[PDB]
Symmetry: D2
Subunit: 431 residues, 4 copies
């Protein structure tokens, strides 16, 4: 249901559906969107269980919360807005119109979250969407597509507002990328897929990688910073791109911070020898060990023969491979800094020019400003866990497509629209 | 001044300048922008004369007005705006940050207009820009770059906020497109350059082609529609992408309309035989005749041995090559329509799926709506000349980079920025 | 529950509640607001029945729809918004803070609609409210107050977010008006109460009277204009201030229009003699006959011995007392106009400088503009029934407090807040 | 020129002018506004000198800067904005229309600043204005009116966009307040005039009094706080309502702060005996000594026989009459606080429920938030002089009419407009 044997079929189906969607009222779109939100909540446990079973990554309870967040806080048609300028020369409107059929490449970390979040946004703007799901999360992804189409059916149709394929491949992704009925592709993934999309001759909205540092200075609430940082790091076993993945801590509070992490936040400190063993396990000749990504801390420790604990920590240099590299594992090094400017320099290196996400615990407005300016990320969270950036304990809406590479930031319905100016000359200014 | 021997030098220079620009206050940027506006006005006659002399296209008086429009109505730092959401969970800001060094590929139709308009916008957002000017308008383009740098010098620097090269080529455009210090390219030109940009692995903001129809229905002010349409068509000899390039007229008013065009608007009606000769002249085995593009009507008529007149008109079918093809010449066919829905169908075919610009003369709100929905263009002008779309007799700002292919519409400073969300958790909501 | 024996008690109670509300999160306010919306829908039939029984005015089915509209389309906390300006000099925020305890004077036409609509808006902005209900609709009004407090209790409190008195009087309204703990009064009623409020030394948000003309010109869809106009006029038996209360029709379509009204819209045309009898009935030495206001057409006709029909119509001069005077009865005179400018002149006289509401059926953009500029009302509806102005078949939110006298227009949560500027100097601009 | 013998003449003249202004284009209004800005700058020295000579208050150099600020940063027609909502049900616009002729009551502290600032704003929205100037600043005020009319003449008229009377009185203010052609009064003054305006049966936009505390905590940059606070306090000899008028300082930094004030900021510390003499001088049986208001510190000290120095300071209790009372003199008491919460409590008492202005020097986000929430003022400045609140070293526009009593905050053009909703049903949504 919405799932096809080949990519050309999927696209044609979505194209037919879009002729209806584009003519639907906002109330009609919103009825479908409401049905999607409801079904996402109703089946959050199933979606969450499916992802862990299929990919081996993450954990069920956190994926339930992520789907609840998508359902509650993804913008709908209220995100489609109009500007008006009027005067003696008349009325000029700027509207957000559909692109048409949008292609979307989705990850195996937040598979159904991305699919459902993209769909709500894209439908609100009058589009339909065709997915090429990640090959490691195909069943989970297509289940979400099927749910979306059931929701639309329950609200009177049409079917195929979201489409996918049974056996997504590099080849089927290439059919999408070169298909002339797809004017826009939303690429949520790694530099591999995204560069390909930005080489397609289409507009591409491109997520990128991150390696988010969290800087803690001596003005911070250190007890709360420990709680926030481990909560954010270990959320869905560090799978989210936004999650804290290393700490830069001012010398004077580093011991207090790590002590709290061990004593109150379920962190286990590993020795140099244990760091060496863990490094050899999780970084391989083929790169990141796929058998380790998104595993919980107790499992990773077990894998190297070390038997409550939810995070692995240690103090190290920024160049340490478990600190400099984005692991998507609950492994969190603490880098000690001599001074604030030292700390900012370390955090900037650690972010690696991704301009994705960065975090700080500090009560000082000048410090916060300095860091924000220097690090220049799509996301900056101050005195909360990273997930405050997508509306979990922070103001603002949720997305799972953070267009750090192409600059649109946290994408929503308005992102996936074409701008149209309508100039009504010398009339309809009523003033 | 701002002009370099090779593209790598240009880019490095712009990159150095941008480290200063990004740290400049809005007042500092605006001082430079004001100086640029002033200099553009001061040298509009020179820029206009240079373009006609160098390219052989357009006319001086209209290019003066286009530069005046750029100077008066291109947005500056006021276009860089901030959103805030606040509540018990604190304060979330969304800001527009710089990309960095932006590459820009510019046309030979509105060469200096595009360069100056792009620069004002890009500087406002904290960027610098490197141009690869059109090879047919190199001297005009680089003069504009030099003016921009003189303006910046007059306001205290820095130099190289806008850079270019002495001898732009396909090769130098390729250095820009593949340069890792350029994260964004603004491509103002034809499908050739734009597709290349959208294959570059960078975000590309892409202008496209158009073929703007103007539909006149029987409710229109026909005398004024004749005036508006010929004024818009013949503006800078039909060079602008937005200009009217064919008419679709309801049968009942078509004769009245064309009569007005001949009697009051300086139009000359050509016979079938003359249409045939003109077609053979302006469409060639190599495509559009470069020796004809942007020539005035008296010149084009002279070229086929026909000796006040500012536009060539005739009645014909939509498929007629002087009607279906975008000529950028003051040649305007009138296509007769049986009914409104017939007229909309003809206009939609004639726009060729460019979703660029379209125009209508009608006083009927339902008719206007029908047409606007069906034609789905970045620009729709109602009851005015096309140039009302860029702020000449219409509400709204000016641009010369209309991103019809990639969907950003009429570009301005905000277009050329990265979005950043800053989440201040549990503080700085003062309510 | 929320209802007190005397006004000073009510105000103190609301004042205590407001110390909690102002510190509530938007999510907490919205939980209560959601409960209020739900309860309003659940008890819409009861509220509607109570009003007709108590006041003798209006009709139950339409009052059900009015309460559904209030519940669905009154803005909540989303209407409380923040502006931000940032640059080198730091960050400036403008926020909407509470006034405190707001007093409100409400009508007997839309009693509970006004109370519930005011409360949702006022609560969203951090205020509480104290009502002095209309003495003709006390039981209906206080039932609505009780419902509001039940909703708040169901969501965890506090009680007394809305308060009222058991026996509202002119005297108790004067205690409210002169009470130093009430910095703002929202006055929904007649010139009597509103002027008193604007003499109170407090800010007053003041509804005024109207006499809304609907102009139909020869370009209109006349069959649909007949339907829309009688639907709008007869909605809740013409009680709403926005409702059509006289027609100005271009000569050429007047007969067609009235024919449709009689043949398809349940209108009964009265003779001059019948007009005379009806005039003597409904206009009295004491003014409008209270026994006639808000009665259906069949009843009014019966009252003068005339026995499907839902509206009384006739053709007459603008000065005819059943045309020039706001009756809040389904009595609708048609004034014939020679020309558009004649029609605009007649409609402007008929609106009596209230600048409240006016309506037009016309497909011509210039005509619409002319009329809109000339009539200068808080509300102008084009080609729909009047109730499109409050979100019933038109874009936009619902209100029952239209501040035509003081200029705030269709009031909502943002209306009832104080503006606060917060200047964070030389920090927290992250760009 | 714009100045009349009696108030009825002034109002009729303004009423005639407004029929033209309301029909003027934004470009036409802005041409006049530009001329007003230019003339204000050109004659700032004259306006400044006139005020000091006439009233005996303030100082010329600071009044020059205040007029430069008015000219540069008062919003014009860009502050008049439009909202649009569109969908299947059509297009709804909300516009800002004129009130008409606005009455304005202006002060003798910032006489011409208020007049010019009000006029720019009011003209932008399509209004004209009639002033009743303060009787102590009549010549200065009417000079400003004359300048405004010269500016309008220079831009082609009309004359009388701003009107005044030769001999303003309580009686002429009452003619304005009760005049039926004035639907709105902007009252910039003391509780006396404002309450009268809020008793007039008109909408009144009401400035109120203040007594702005500046709280300095132990996290502040104390050297800079000393500079900022004395600069803000002593600006135009403490005449502005926004200016710092007492300090609440955390014990631990109070001595450092006052030491800096004496050593670097030209403060003179007075003994208890000198405080007693100064109190007897400046507070009298008739209230504030008019012969002392707005005098410089050297003069006030001289007046009690005490002979570089620009501010008088001393440490005292909050109830000390030179601390608790708003003096509009460069007299600044420092109140010592035991703790932050103590300091907030003291500052809140000192503001006296005016909800006007308050200030803080602190680098701590939580502290700032606590204070902002507790003090609930129209203006809160953090880590700058008070005048950052009107755009002098802070983000945001300038006003001299801060509607603290009625809640509109820092008034501008949009403040002085009526809101109009225009519902275009089932057309002109182009999506
Ligand atoms: C989670 C992860 C380790 C799983 O690895 P995996 O199972 O081997 O799958 P991969 O993502 O490496 O991709 C396998 C191949 O399919 C491609 N691919 C990825 N997503 C695809 C999709 N929807 N559709 C089609 N092909 C896809 C990849 O490019 C790759 O091809 P390649 O061999 O030419 O490089 C990996 O996806 C990853 O590291 N993702 C992080 C990217 C990201 O968004 N990071 C921010 C979050 S912290
Ligand atoms: C005006 C015009 C007829 C002049 O033609 P021209 O002098 O032959 O120049 P061209 O634009 O055709 O380009 C010549 C070559 O340089 C390329 N080129 C164009 N702009 C370039 C630029 N800034 N920098 C480097 N190369 C450029 C072209 O791709 C082309 O290469 P190709 O042979 O591989 O196709 C032509 O530019 C044109 O038709 N432009 C319309 C595009 C447009 O924006 N239309 C909307 C306005 S109505
Ligand atoms: C419906 C209506 C005819 C009922 O008349 P009514 O039962 O006699 O009640 P009234 O509104 O005339 O008011 C009776 C008295 O109580 C006053 N009053 C009205 N509302 C009051 C309220 N909430 N609380 C206290 N007193 C109120 C009135 O000022 C009046 O006092 P008065 O004798 O000094 O003038 C009358 O309210 C009316 O005409 N309202 C229209 C006002 C309006 O908003 N029109 C736009 C809608 S079309
Ligand atoms: C500066 C000041 C001390 C000068 O005092 P003044 O010369 O005696 O003039 P006043 O303002 O006291 O007013 C004198 C009388 O004219 C009235 N008045 C004030 N402004 C008026 C105006 N434009 N037009 C007509 N009457 C006016 C006053 O109400 C007063 O009448 P009253 O005797 O019934 O009370 C006094 O105006 C003042 O204290 N203003 C502060 C109000 C304010 O805005 N404070 C915030 C700034 S810190």
């Amino acid at each position: 249901l919405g799932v096809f044997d080949d990519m050309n079929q999927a696209i044609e189906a979505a194209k037919e559906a879009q002729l209806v969607v584009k003519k639907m009222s906002m109330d009609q779109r919103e009825k479908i969107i409401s049905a999607i939100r409801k079904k996402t909540i109703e089946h959050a446990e199933t979606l969450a269980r499916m992802a862990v079973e299929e990919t081996g990554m993450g954990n069920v309870g956190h994926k339930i919360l992520k789907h609840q967040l998508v359902a509650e806080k993804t913008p709908g048609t209220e995100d489609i807005t109009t500007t008006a300028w009027s005067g003696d020369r008349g009325l000029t409107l700027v509207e957000m119109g559909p692109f048409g059929v949008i292609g979307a490449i989705t990850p195996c970390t937040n598979p159904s979250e991305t699919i459902i979040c993209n769909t709500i946004g894209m439908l609100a703007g009058g589009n339909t969407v065709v997915f090429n799901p990640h090959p490691a999360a195909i069943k989970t992804s297509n289940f979400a597509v099927q749910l979306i189409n059931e929701a639309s059916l329950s609200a009177g149709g049409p079917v195929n507002i979201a489409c996918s394929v049974r056996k997504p491949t590099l080849d089927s992704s290439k059919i999408m990328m070169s298909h002339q009925d797809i004017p826009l592709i939303a690429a949520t993934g790694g530099p591999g897929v995204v560069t390909a999309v930005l080489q397609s001759g289409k507009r591409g909205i491109g997520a990128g990688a991150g390696n988010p540092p969290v800087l803690v200075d001596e003005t911070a609430d250190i007890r709360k910073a420990a709680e926030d940082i481990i909560n954010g790091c270990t959320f869905d076993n560090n799978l989210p791109a936004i999650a804290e993945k290393e700490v830069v801590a001012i010398d004077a509070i580093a011991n207090e911070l790590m002590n709290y992490m061990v004593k109150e936040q379920g962190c286990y400190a590993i020795t140099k020898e244990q760091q060496e063993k863990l490094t050899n396990l999780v970084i391989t000749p083929k790169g990141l060990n796929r058998n380790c990504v998104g595993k919980d801390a107790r499992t990773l420790l077990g894998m190297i023969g070390i038997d409550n604990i939810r995070c692995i920590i240690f103090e190290g240099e920024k160049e340490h491979p478990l600190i400099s590299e984005e692991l998507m594992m609950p492994i969190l090094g603490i880098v000690r800094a001599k001074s604030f400017d030292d700390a900012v320099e370390k955090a900037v290196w650690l972010e690696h020019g991704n301009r994705h996400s960065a975090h700080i615990h500090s009560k000082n407005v000048d410090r916060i400003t300095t860091y924000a300016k220097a690090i220049d990320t799509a996301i900056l969270v101050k005195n909360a866990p990273s997930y405050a950036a997508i509306g979990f304990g922070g103001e603002g809406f949720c997305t799972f497509t953070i267009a750090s590479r192409t600059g649109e930031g946290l994408t929503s319905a308005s992102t996936f629209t074409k701008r149209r100016r309508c100039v009504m000359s010398d009339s309809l200014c009523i003033r």
